[PDB]
Design an enzyme around this catalytic site. Structure first.
Site, short mmCIF file in Angstrom:
data_model
loop_
_atom_site.label_atom_id
_atom_site.label_comp_id
_atom_site.label_asym_id
_atom_site.label_seq_id
_atom_site.Cartn_x
_atom_site.Cartn_y
_atom_site.Cartn_z
N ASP A 7 5.12 61.35 -5.03
CA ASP A 7 3.59 61.97 -4.28
C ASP A 7 4.01 62.46 -3.48
O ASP A 7 3.80 61.29 -2.11
CB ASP A 7 3.30 60.99 -4.83
CG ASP A 7 1.47 61.66 -4.14
OD1 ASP A 7 1.08 62.53 -4.02
OD2 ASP A 7 0.62 60.94 -4.42
N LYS A 68 1.04 69.12 5.34
CA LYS A 68 0.48 69.67 4.57
C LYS A 68 0.08 70.90 4.07
O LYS A 68 0.32 71.65 3.51
CB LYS A 68 0.38 68.69 2.95
CG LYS A 68 0.46 69.41 1.90
CD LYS A 68 0.46 67.78 1.08
CE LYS A 68 0.02 68.29 -0.62
NZ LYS A 68 0.24 67.24 -1.62
N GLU A 172 0.07 67.70 -9.26
CA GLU A 172 -0.71 66.81 -8.85
C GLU A 172 -1.52 65.87 -10.39
O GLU A 172 -1.69 65.01 -10.77
CB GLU A 172 -1.38 66.74 -7.74
CG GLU A 172 -0.51 66.16 -6.47
CD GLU A 172 -1.04 67.09 -5.30
OE1 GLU A 172 -2.19 66.38 -5.10
OE2 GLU A 172 -0.24 67.22 -4.49
N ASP A 196 -9.48 63.26 -8.07
CA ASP A 196 -9.11 63.29 -7.01
C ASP A 196 -9.14 63.33 -6.23
O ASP A 196 -9.56 63.90 -5.34
CB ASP A 196 -7.99 64.57 -7.35
CG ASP A 196 -6.51 63.35 -6.88
OD1 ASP A 196 -6.98 62.37 -5.56
OD2 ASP A 196 -4.93 63.65 -6.82
N1 ADP Z 1 -9.54 50.36 -2.02
C1 ADP Z 1 -9.81 51.29 -1.78
N2 ADP Z 1 -11.39 50.98 -0.85
C2 ADP Z 1 -10.84 52.27 -0.55
N3 ADP Z 1 -10.61 53.37 0.23
C3 ADP Z 1 -9.12 53.31 -0.06
C4 ADP Z 1 -9.04 52.39 -1.19
N4 ADP Z 1 -7.29 52.12 -0.92
C5 ADP Z 1 -6.75 53.20 -0.23
N5 ADP Z 1 -7.93 54.36 -0.18
C6 ADP Z 1 -8.02 55.29 0.58
O1 ADP Z 1 -7.58 56.25 -0.06
C7 ADP Z 1 -6.95 57.19 0.63
C8 ADP Z 1 -5.53 58.06 0.56
O2 ADP Z 1 -5.81 58.28 -0.46
P1 ADP Z 1 -4.10 58.10 -1.20
O3 ADP Z 1 -4.59 58.96 -2.73
O4 ADP Z 1 -3.51 57.01 -1.54
O5 ADP Z 1 -3.27 59.75 -0.02
P2 ADP Z 1 -3.69 61.07 -0.21
O6 ADP Z 1 -5.29 61.58 -0.44
O7 ADP Z 1 -3.21 61.30 1.08
O8 ADP Z 1 -2.90 61.52 -1.86
C9 ADP Z 1 -7.02 55.90 2.69
O9 ADP Z 1 -8.71 57.18 3.02
C10 ADP Z 1 -7.47 55.21 1.88
O10 ADP Z 1 -8.56 54.65 3.75
MG MG Z 2 -3.23 62.79 -3.48
NA NA Z 3 -0.56 60.46 -2.14
NA NA Z 4 -6.19 65.01 -3.29
#
Ligand code: ADP
Ligand code: MG
Ligand code: NA
Ligand code: NA
Lengths: 386, 92
Positions: A7, A68, A172, A196
């Protein structure tokens, strides 16, 4: 040697592998099952992931993220022009192509978005190689459902530059559906909503699945709404606090603001499983130690508009798909921000108490699906049937 | 459906004999498929010949390529049987 699923996320990246009949989401050498999509260029070294993000405050102009948002685009693109105002690093035009420009080992250097993303992919590959104790060449890599051919090809090129052979670029929301085995069902078609909420972007996708065949029925969301924005709501809150307590404004000190944001993100995560969180920062501004507390209630209030607003794209995706909310067979939580209790409550209430699919860590779901798919495409996940 | 049935009968017919599968794959491919040249058994004698033809076939029926196409279900069925046949061949 197995193929892996990657991912490649806007804010974080995640790698999984299907081996010995199970998907493992692979922890990096710092113990984290997700890795920041960050690349830092210093006097002496190139840093990727946790080490890159961790030093952002000391080295803002030479630490790249958000690649990205650039990938597969032209410099002249309205999106690139708009996004550029948000970044502390330089973006330049190379014959119609955007390039990030940094200082590195005492030299000015520039990189295409796919090159930057190749460094992230390289790190994810190494994370997998540490765990497997062997080289990784083949991978499935994921992208947003709304990516066009240009963005997909640029993502593939990033893999190639990272020494990977990309078996497939898949969507995704579809990766998340595969992780839950939703494409293993037979009979009538079923409708799946993927909710998402990540670090930078919010995506709602409605998929129809029949006999393992996917159709993306509609997509909705906000490319500029994510966990980062919830962090910023906390930051403003604490800038006010510090100004009242100390007769000092930290707002124009970029280092202090970034260090505060780091602390706020950590507190936010804590608030997903506890009802309060403490913050401690040594010498935040002009010698003053900052110590404070925040409750889950106060966090939710600071973000109240942004949270309930996530339901509008849900409504939009539903009408574009020509479905009533009661026609959704499965709801899948994806993205780190969907760990927020209020978000889950808000969405479940919208769907009249219907159970949410959340047993797979939402920030790992896309990688999980990509891993399954990579095994299938490699001949390493035959069915046989009993 | 008829195209599915044709593949089910082919798969059962060849008993996972990779040579038998590759030499007759032209008979199960969808209408519209124009890349695959029918392969005769004389081009399938040596293990090196089987490997080369196998790799060509998987490229034709690859699920990634086939995603969103009307023949997707059929590409998948053929791909998975070819992979099984290859792994069995490798076992020998
Ligand atoms: N337990 C949690 N509670 C709230 N927010 C979280 C938690 N774990 C991760 N996050 C938040 O999720 C976000 C990242 O999301 P993720 O799906 O891992 O990556 P992306 O969006 O790049 O695909 C960040 O803002 C992070 O702070
Ligand atoms: Mg994502
Ligand atoms: Na991610
Ligand atoms: Na997203």
């Amino acid at each position: 040697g197995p193929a892996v699923g990657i991912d490649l996320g806007t804010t974080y990246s995640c790698v999984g592998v299907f081996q010995h009949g199970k998907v493992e989401i692979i922890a990096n050498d710092q113990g984290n099952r997700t890795t920041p999509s960050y690349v830092a260029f210093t006097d002496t070294e190139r840093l990727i992931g946790d080490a890159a993000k961790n030093q952002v405050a000391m080295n803002p102009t030479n630490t790249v993220f958000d690649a990205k948002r650039l990938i597969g685009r032209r410099f002249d693109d309205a999106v690139v022009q708009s996004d550029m105002k948000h970044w502390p690093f330089m973006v330049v035009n190379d014959a119609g192509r955007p390039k990030v420009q940094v200082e590195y080992k005492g030299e000015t250097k520039s990189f295409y978005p796919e090159e930057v993303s190749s460094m992230v992919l390289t790190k994810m590959k190494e994370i997998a190689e540490a765990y497997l104790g062997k080289t990784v060449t083949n991978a499935v890599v994921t992208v947003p459902a709304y990516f066009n051919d240009s963005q997909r090809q640029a993502t593939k090129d990033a893999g190639t530059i990272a020494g990977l052979n990309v078996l497939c670029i898949i969507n995704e929301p579809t990766a998340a559906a595969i992780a839950y085995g939703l494409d293993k069902k037979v009979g009538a078609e079923r409708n799946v909503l993927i909710f998402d909420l990540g670090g930078g972007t919010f995506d709602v996708s409605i998929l129809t699945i029949e006999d393992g065949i996917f159709e993306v029925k509609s997509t909705a969301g906000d490319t500029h709404l994510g966990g980062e924005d919830f962090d910023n709501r906390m930051v403003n809150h604490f800038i006010a606090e510090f100004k009242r307590k100390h007769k000092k404004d930290i707002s124009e000190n970029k280092r202090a603001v970034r260090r505060l944001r780091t602390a706020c993100e950590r507190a936010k995560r804590t608030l997903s499983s506890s009802t309060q969180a403490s913050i401690e920062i040594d010498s935040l501004y002009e010698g003053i130690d900052f110590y404070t507390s925040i409750t889950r209630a106060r966090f939710e209030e600071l973000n109240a508009d942004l949270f309930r607003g996530t339901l509008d794209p849900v409504e939009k995706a539903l009408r574009d798909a020509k479905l009533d909310k009661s026609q959704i067979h499965d709801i899948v939580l994806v993205g780190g921000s969907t760990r927020i209790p209020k978000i889950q409550k808000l969405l479940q209430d919208f769907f009249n108490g219907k159970e949410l699919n959340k047993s797979i860590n939402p920030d790992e779901a896309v990688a999980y699906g990509a891993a399954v798919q990579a095994a299938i495409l490699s001949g390493d996940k035959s069915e046989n049937v009993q | 459906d008829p195209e599915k049935l044709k593949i089910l009968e082919w798969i059962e017919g060849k008993e996972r004999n990779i040579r038998a599968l590759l030499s007759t794959m032209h008979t199960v491919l969808w209408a519209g498929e124009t890349k695959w040249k029918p392969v005769g058994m004389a081009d399938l004698v040596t293990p090196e010949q089987v490997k080369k033809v196998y790799r060509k076939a998987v490229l034709v029926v690859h699920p990634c390529k086939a995603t969103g196409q009307p023949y997707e279900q059929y590409a998948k069925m053929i791909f998975m049987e070819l992979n099984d046949a290859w792994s069995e061949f490798e076992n020998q």
